[PDB]
């Protein structure tokens, strides 16, 4: 009945190809799902997990997905194993867990000296992220010492000059400036499930629309889809345009005009009027704000919409 909880296991293959922040898309992801008694044991689940996915218990390790105060979600460490599952999840239901597995047993992890770090390589030429797996590293390890593993996993020649960032959270990608300090010195509040994003330091990057990973994540963070509806066409479903929240009036107008194969001066836009259907007040072309300022009367979930008419 309500004595049961759902436990959701995510595997590393789901981290592959992810273009967003964190390890995967919380809104779109494959899980192996388990119905488990809230008062069942960890050791029970582990055996039941072992039997089910064809892996001996020595070759698997559970890293519960943990929500952070800043809104991100990351694998966290989990000796303990006789507490109930609902206590370990701290009353989260469902509870999502990253399942690390070996591949031709797992290396030991010292809860006090190591950290599990995830790696992403950014390619400015194609403007894409490439998941480079995870590593066990001693906290006392210098940043410089991590470079060969990064070069190795990205397919770069050894001693390739790299630029390194910490992906802290959406719109916060912090460049690591001194490669010769320990990891805990480089990364404030160093934790398991932290992410280092790195890229080749080549002059050819600056021809890219998005030359660094910081730029990439900034663009992604401000990206917004807006429905545009023709005021003079009743019950128009409208069309979707991908914009940026930091666009000014002119950039919106021009983008919508290229969508409609027309001139931006032949387009009159109207504000949202919110929950009411239909156009609100006219938008003037000397508007001094950003697209974000125009859509701030919308919640993050509420579908963004604007009205237009051809002149």
């Amino acid at each position: 009945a309500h004595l049961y909880m759902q436990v959701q296991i995510v595997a590393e293959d789901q981290f592959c190809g992810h273009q967003g922040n964190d390890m995967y898309d919380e809104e779109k992801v494959k899980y192996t799902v388990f119905k488990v008694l809230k008062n069942s044991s960890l050791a029970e689940f582990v055996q039941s997990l072992s039997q089910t996915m064809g892996f001996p218990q020595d070759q698997i390790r559970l890293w519960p997905m943990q929500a952070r105060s800043n809104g991100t979600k990351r694998p966290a460490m989990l000796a303990d194993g006789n507490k109930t599952m609902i206590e370990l999840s701290d009353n989260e239901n469902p509870w999502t867990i990253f399942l690390e597995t070996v591949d031709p047993t797992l290396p030991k992890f010292d809860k006090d000296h190591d950290v599990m770090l995830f790696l992403k390589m950014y390619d400015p030429k194609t403007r894409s992220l490439n998941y480079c797996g995870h590593i066990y590293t001693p906290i006392s390890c210098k940043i410089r010492d991590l470079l060969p593993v990064m070069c190795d996993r990205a397919g770069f020649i050894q001693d390739t000059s790299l630029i390194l960032y910490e992906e802290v959270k959406p719109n916060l990608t912090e460049r690591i400036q001194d490669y010769d300090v320990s990891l805990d010195k480089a990364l404030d509040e160093l934790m398991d499930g932290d992410i280092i994003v790195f890229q080749k330091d080549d002059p050819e990057n600056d021809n890219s629309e998005l030359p660094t990973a910081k730029e990439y994540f900034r663009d992604l963070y401000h990206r917004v889809d807006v429905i545009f509806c023709d005021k003079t066409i009743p019950n128009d479903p409208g069309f979707v345009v991908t914009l940026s929240n930091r666009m000014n009036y002119f950039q919106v107008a021009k983008t919508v005009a290229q969508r409609l194969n027309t001139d931006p001066m032949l387009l009159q836009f109207f504000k949202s009027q919110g929950y009411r259907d239909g156009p609100g007040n006219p938008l003037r072309h000397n508007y001094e704000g950003t697209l974000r300022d125009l859509l701030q009367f919308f919640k993050p979930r509420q579908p963004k919409k604007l009205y237009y008419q051809q002149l």
Binding site: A67, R68, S69, N70, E92, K169
Partner: peptide, 13 residues
């Protein structure tokens, strides 16, 4: 002077 933090600690329920 004191640290404001980056919110990487665990979210309250």
């Amino acid at each position: 002077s004191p640290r404001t933090g980056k919110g990487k600690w665990k979210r309250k329920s």
